[PDB]
Each structure stands twice: as structure tokens, then as C-alpha cells.
């Protein structure tokens, strides 16, 4: 049956980790990881999630199935965080949230909900996009198209090329937005361009589907959500896919949310029950632990206080590593302005290096970067900066 | 977009829980729950998983993503438990395991692996089957057919009707087997009939897909696996979908496994990488907590010792509740032999009650049973037995 000729192929960002843990070479550096690392090169458990898991250890009395949409508190915290406490959507009950196995679990659920309950045939993902959005959408049977996004020769957002490539999208087409700055690019848009894109989806009939995996890593938790909140300010309907893997350090617990907005409460509840039947046929009901830890921290000032400082330290670290990188590049002699790496947000940026320049990095210097030129700033530490920069300088 | 006429419908076993928590009525009893309950009517956390989670609390230092297939230890324990320690399959490396979000997450992954990488078009599920197998398989796009299984007027397995309905299955058809006795029926087959069905799938070309969610609840952990191990004794290929929700009391952590067997190592690894690409496009990588708790208990004699006694007490409880039920039925005067409820294994049996008789139970006596006549023996306690039996007796 699988009796031969069952095919094979590898994940573009993950497969690199294998010939990372494979090298003897001392200075060896893994960039193009997905996760945050501290100054030690460890991805530590947050103190707040350790405190939260101790609470949970003493207080859980059962391990009985969660509802198909998960933990109630979690969903409300997820909407408080994505849309605000003073918020029409939460208020008017036009948003329903399903806790999901990670932000990627939420996109498959958006995708399957969409494929069988609507007329949506295409979904539009930026070029470039996180590689896996495409597979999520194709596995639901939706076909995936690509709108322009990244400049390249200016290292910015090509706003004109974005708009002018998206016009080709017809009305019931889904367009995927990166709310909290973009993987792999690090680029935004500005609030004005978010407003401009929110406008041009209202009059042109597109359905927004936000992917929101790095809330609290660009400017700040709430500042990051202006984009989503510009679109929700004027969309009758939208889907958000959020993850708590990054900002809570809760990666292997698979914590995420799939929020649906639908015009009014009644509609959102009829649509969200088909969202719940898509989940039920998939993984049945979500994993309690990580989400139980998220609902406890956020629903406790003591613990949310420490978490936010923990998030402010993660974010602060990456910002001085984006600054120490551009700077040790200047310092070890670079022939190019890498200062675009500043106002580029989050862990990732395309460094402008070519396929050739990347392979040359891994082979010659032990600096593993995702084959596209994307590097993870959080995998950089103040003791890394000089081996790192030296290598890049050698190559250009 | 969801702007109306987006449809709706409810889950046949779950929707009952809502007008369960909705009644004032004192004696109120919820049967047709899925989970185990102790003599108190609580679904307690196992001592062993509390000890295991304390270990984990002190020893985890990171919450970094698990591989797409999960925790290595977990997968080997899952194969030690499903096929044995002295086992050709594990030995010859012809079995690969993906930790999955619950046994239902494993069936969707089997289903999606099958739909896009093979010629499988139909899958055959017993009539009756756990309601949700069908939706799992239809959402993958496979069409679902039903083979005969349950007698009704003898309250047993109709073996002739099973075999003679399955002949209609062509060679690349998948047939779903319940390894560890059957949901909703409680019926088996015998080792001889397992041997007989394993035989008749070898010469007839069917692909076995086992659903294994109640290991250690029928006879014992290992005794329960004779069926799976009769089929694996002679199948080049098979898929197992197992869950640790029941036997570990780990329901909301979503712990499961999807095992693939493929003739030889090379094949199983080419097939399992397409299994991993199906997972990657679904939920990306599985939840650590519950599986981390399963790998710790099973990979520690002290803790596995206490767990097994905990499993032997769960199983022992249900066996005396199947016996106290048939007995208080005899005692409160029953007009019918309910002794078929003995050798019927697990928590569930069809009691032989009609749709009419069930609605009459909930409305008149506050005894919620799944509309099909299926009742969960573990939701019965020694203080329940008399309200319970009285009600059923009143109705027949
Ligand atoms: C846009 C997006 C990106 O870029 C990622 C990055 N790995 C993720 C990850 O999903 P998670 O479930 O948090 O691992 C999700 N989403 C929705
Ligand atoms: C056959 C089977 C049944 O009957 C059930 C019962 N709920 C499950 C449950 O999946 P889980 O993921 O353990 O909740 C799975 N499987 C595979």
C-alpha cells in the first residue's frame, strides 16, 4: 500500500537543525532557528510559567476534557490582548475563540473551516511568507497565491507592488496578513499603510486572515496590535490566528488561538460551530497545560506583572542584538549598510545575503542561517557578535 | 463571507453534557460521558501523573519545540506497549511513531496521510462505531463505508455478518479495527476471530488501521493487545492510532500516538516522512506536557508500578460496576438479562434500551445516557446503583 513509491521532501527551516547538530567546530552558531534564546543561548522556561505551573500542580484536581474551543478564561484573555479590554468586538460578542494546538493549529482550522463552509478558493500569502502557511492552506484544498511585499533593493515593504498585486484578488479571496511583524522579513506596514490596506479590503471585498505569532516583540503587546485593530475597526468579518509559543516561551506546549469575527453575535456563533466541527474532526479538543498556564499568568496581576517584564526583557534583548549586529558589522569593517536590520522588528530579518553567501557561511565559518538569507537575531548573544560578524564580513 | 447561510449541527455524545449541566433534580446521573469516574464521581489526576508532573516541574529547563513526531522515549514506550518488548516490529525498525494530540489527532493524521499519499479511497468502520471516526475519515476526503458488527438480538458480535459485509471491500480499502474493546458496543472479537480477521485481510488485501484508545481496560495492558499483535504478526503494513487519555487519566493533555508499520525500515521511513509533512501542515509539532508525563511514568519502575496499580484499580472498579449493575438490575426486579453487560469490556455497553427508553430515562428519572442506548459503566458508583437500576427497571 505504501509498498513503494510513496514520495518524501524536507522542511526548509527545520532540516537545517540536523546538520547543525552535527559539527565539532567550536565557534558554531545556529541562526535560522525559530525560537528566542537568552544571553546564554538557552531557551529558558519563564519564571512566571514556572510559578503558574506550580499553582496548577497543587490546584488541578482533574485532567478531564476541555470543551472543543478550550479554556474560557484563555479565550477572553486572547481577545483582551488581540482587540483590547475596551473593545467593541468582545463587547458586542462578535468574536469567538478556539484554543488550538499552536498558531499553526489555528491556521489549519481557519483553513479547513474556510474550505468546507465557504466559497473561498484562493488565499493570498505575502511573498515571502513563513514557508508553512502555504502547506496549511493547500492541505485544506485552498489554492495559494502570492502577493508582492518585500522590496529587496531598498530592503523595505514595496507598498505599490503589494497593492497592485492584490487587485488581482477577487472578492471572496482570503488575504493573509502578518499582524506583528513579518516572518521572514521583519518589515511591517506602518499604521497608515495598515489603515490603507484595511480600507482597500473593505471596498474590494477581501476576507482578512491575520497571523499573529509575535505579539509583544516588535514595539510592545498593545502597540503591536494596531494593525489587527485597524482591520477589526472596519471589518464585519475576519479570522485571527495567534500563538503564545514565543511571548510565553511556551513552544512545545502548543498554545494558540483561532478567533473568528462575523458581523454580529448570531452569525459568529453559527460560523464558530462549523469551526468547532472542523476541530472535532481534527484533534477533538485542545491541550490544557500551556493554555492553562497562559490563562493563570494573564488572570493574576502578580504573575502577569512578572511575565510582562519577562516579555519586555526578551524584546529588549533582541533590540540591542539588532543594534549590536549592525554595529559589530560596522566595526569588523562591512562594505554594506545592514542598518535596515533596525526597524525590522522581531527575531527575524533577511540579511540580504545570497544562497551562495549562506552556504559559504555554514561550510566555511559554522554560521547556520536559513537558506533564504533569514537570520534569527535572538540566536545572537554579546559573545557571539564578533565570530558572527567576522564571518559575514568575510563573505560581504 | 459567513454573511449568512453558513450551516450548523451538534455532536451526538457531547451535546448531551449541556442538558446534563442543566437539571436541579437531586438523583441526576450522567452516563454517556466518555471519561472514567471513581467511587466519588470525580475524574481524579493519577498519583503517578502528579509525581511525574512534580519531577517535570523541577527538571524542565526549556519549553522548546519537540520534533514533528514528538518525544523519542514516548514513541518507544508506545511501541513497547502496543507490540511488546520482545518484538520483531520494533526490532526490525518497521514501525514509526508520531506523538499526536490525542488518539483522535492520530486518526486525522492517518487519514490525511492516506488521502494524499495513497490510492485509498474507502475506509470501512464498524456499525456501530464511535460517531467521530466517520468525520475524521470524511474530512480527509476518504469516503466511509460500514461493515456489520453488532448482533442486537443476541447482544454479541455477528461474526458472519462482519466477514460477509467486508468481502465487498476491495484490495486498497482501509478497514478500521477497534483493538481494545469496542466503542459503543463493549464487544471484542476473540483471539480466534482476530486471527481469523487477520488472515482474511492478508489474502483479501485490506489495510488495517487500529484504533486503540482503551489499552489496559478490558483484560489487562498486554492481554488487550493480542488483537493488534495478531494482525502485526502477519501484516507487512498497518497503522495504529492510540490514546493515553483514558489509561493515564490524561484526557485534556491530548496525549496520543500514530504508529505506521510498512514492510521494512526504509519504506516505513519514506512513508513516515509524508506522515510528518501531514502533521507539519496540521498542528506542526505535538504538546509536550502529557506525553512527557507518559514517558516519565513508563520509563521509571517506581512510577510505572504505581501507575499500573492505578490502572488495575480503574479497571477493577469498572468490572465490579458491570457486575453490580447486572446484579442491582436482577435485584430491583428486571424483566431482561442484562448479563451480556458482563464480557463486554471497557466503560461502554449498549444496554439494549430504545431511543424511546432513553428519553424516558433523562426526562422522567434524570439518567442521561447517549441517545443510542450506550451507557458508561465508570459513571456508575455503588451509591448510584440503586437510583440507576430503579429507573431502568421502570422503563424495562
Ligand atoms: C505567522 C505564523 C508564523 O510565522 C509562525 C512561526 N513559526 C507560527 C508558528 O506557529 P506556532 O503554532 O506558534 O508554533 C504561526 N504563525 C501563524
Ligand atoms: C477509537 C477511538 C475512540 O473510540 C475514542 C473515544 N473517545 C478516541 C478518543 O480520542 P482521544 O484522542 O483519546 O480523546 C480515540 N479513538 C481512536
From Swiss-Prot, chains A, B:
- Identify the main location: cytoplasm
The biological processes this protein is annotated with in GO are:
L-phenylalanine biosynthetic process; L-phenylalanine biosynthetic process from chorismate via phenylpyruvate
Q: Name one GO molecular function term.
A: protein homodimerization activity
According to the UniProt record, what happens if one changes residue 65 to F/S?
Answer: Slight changes in activity
Cellular localisation: Cytoplasm
Documented EC number(s): 2.6.1.1
Q: What are the cysteine partners in each disulfide bond? A: none
Regulation: induction: Transcription is increased specifically in response to 2,4,6-trinitrotoluene (TNT) and its indicator compounds 1,3-DNB, 2,4-DNT, and 2,6-DNT.
What is the recorded phenotype of mutating residue 374 to A?
A: Reduces first-order rate constant about 10000-fold
Q: How do people use this protein in biotech?
A: Has been used to construct a 2,4,6-trinitrotoluene (TNT) biosensor strain.
Q: What Gene Ontology cellular component terms go with this record?
A: cytoplasm; cytosol
Q: Which reaction does it catalyse?
A: L-aspartate + 2-oxoglutarate = oxaloacetate + L-glutamate
- SUPFAM superfamilies to which the protein is assigned, alphabetical: PLP-dependent transferases
Q: Which InterPro entries match?
A: Aminotransferase_I/II_large, Asp_trans, NHTrfase_class1_PyrdxlP-BS, PyrdxlP-dep_Trfase, PyrdxlP-dep_Trfase_major, PyrdxlP-dep_Trfase_small
Instruction: Read off the Pfam families from this record.
Output: Aminotran_1_2 (PF00155)
What PANTHER family is this protein classified in?
A: ASPARTATE AMINOTRANSFERASE, ASPARTATE AMINOTRANSFERASE, MITOCHONDRIAL
Which family is it part of?
A: Belongs to the class-I pyridoxal-phosphate-dependent aminotransferase family.
* Assembly and binders: Homodimer.
Which named protein is this? Aspartate aminotransferase
The species this protein belongs to is Escherichia coli (strain K12)
Amino acid at each position: 500500500m505504501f509498498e513503494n513509491i510513496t514520495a518524501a521532501p524536507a522542511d526548509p527551516i527545520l532540516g537545517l537543525a540536523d546538520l547543525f547538530r552535527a559539527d565539532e567546530r567550536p565557534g558554531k552558531i545556529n541562526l535560522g532557528i525559530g525560537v528566542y534564546k537568552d544571553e546564554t543561548g538557552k531557551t529558558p522556561v519563564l519564571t512566571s510559567v514556572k510559578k503558574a505551573e506550580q499553582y496548577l500542580l497543587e490546584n488541578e484536581t482533574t485532567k478531564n476534557y476541555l470543551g472543543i474551543d478550550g479554556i474560557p478564561e484563555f479565550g477572553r484573555c486572547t481577545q483582551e490582548l488581540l482587540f483590547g479590554k475596551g473593545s467593541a468586538l468582545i463587547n458586542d460578542k462578535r468574536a469567538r475563540t478556539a484554543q488550538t494546538p499552536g498558531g499553526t493549529g489555528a491556521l489549519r482550522v481557519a483553513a479547513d473551516f474556510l474550505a468546507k463552509n465557504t466559497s473561498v478558493k484562493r488565499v493570498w500569502v505575502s511573498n515571502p511568507s513563513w514557508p508553512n502557511h502555504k502547506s496549511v492552506f493547500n492541505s485544506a484544498g485552498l489554492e495559494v497565491r502570492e502577493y508582492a511585499y518585500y522590496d529587496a533593493e531598498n530592503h523595505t515593504l514595496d507598498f505599490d507592488a503589494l497593492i497592485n498585486s492584490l487587485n488581482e484578488a477577487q472578492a471572496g479571496d482570503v488575504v493573509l496578513f502578518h499582524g506583528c511583524c513579518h516572518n521572514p522579513t521583519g518589515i511591517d506596514p506602518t499604521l497608515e499603510q495598515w489603515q490603507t490596506l484595511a480600507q482597500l479590503s473593505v471596498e474590494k471585498g477581501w476576507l482578512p486572515l491575520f497571523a499573529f505569532a509575535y505579539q509583544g516583540f516588535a514595539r510592545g503587546l498593545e502597540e503591536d496590535a494596531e494593525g489587527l485593530r485597524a482591520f477589526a475597526a472596519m471589518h464585519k468579518e475576519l479570522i485571527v490566528a495567534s500563538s503564545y509559543s514565543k511571548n510565553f516561551g511556551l513552544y512545545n506546549e502548543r498554545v494558540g488561538a483561532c478567533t473568528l469575527v462575523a458581523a454580529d453575535s448570531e452569525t459568529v456563533d453559527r460560523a464558530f460551530s462549523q469551526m468547532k466541527a472542523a476541530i472535532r474532526a481534527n484533534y477533538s479538543n485542545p491541550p490544557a497545560h500551556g493554555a492553562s498556564v497562559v490563562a493563570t499568568i494573564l488572570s493574576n496581576d502578580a504573575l502577569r506583572a512578572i511575565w510582562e517584564q519577562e516579555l519586555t526583557d526578551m524584546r529588549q534583548r533582541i533590540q540591542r542584538m539588532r543594534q549590536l549586529f549592525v554595529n559589530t558589522l560596522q566595526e569588523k569593517g562591512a562594505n554594506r549598510d545592514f542598518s535596515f536590520i533596525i526597524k525590522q522588528n522581531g527575531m527575524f530579518s533577511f540579511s540580504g545575503l545570497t544562497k551562495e553567501q549562506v552556504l559559504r557561511l555554514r561550510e566555511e565559518f559554522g554560521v547556520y542561517a536559513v537558506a533564504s538569507g533569514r537570520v534569527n537575531v535572538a540566536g545572537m548573544t554579546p559573545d557571539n557578535m564578533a565570530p558572527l560578524c567576522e564571518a559575514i564580513v568575510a563573505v560581504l
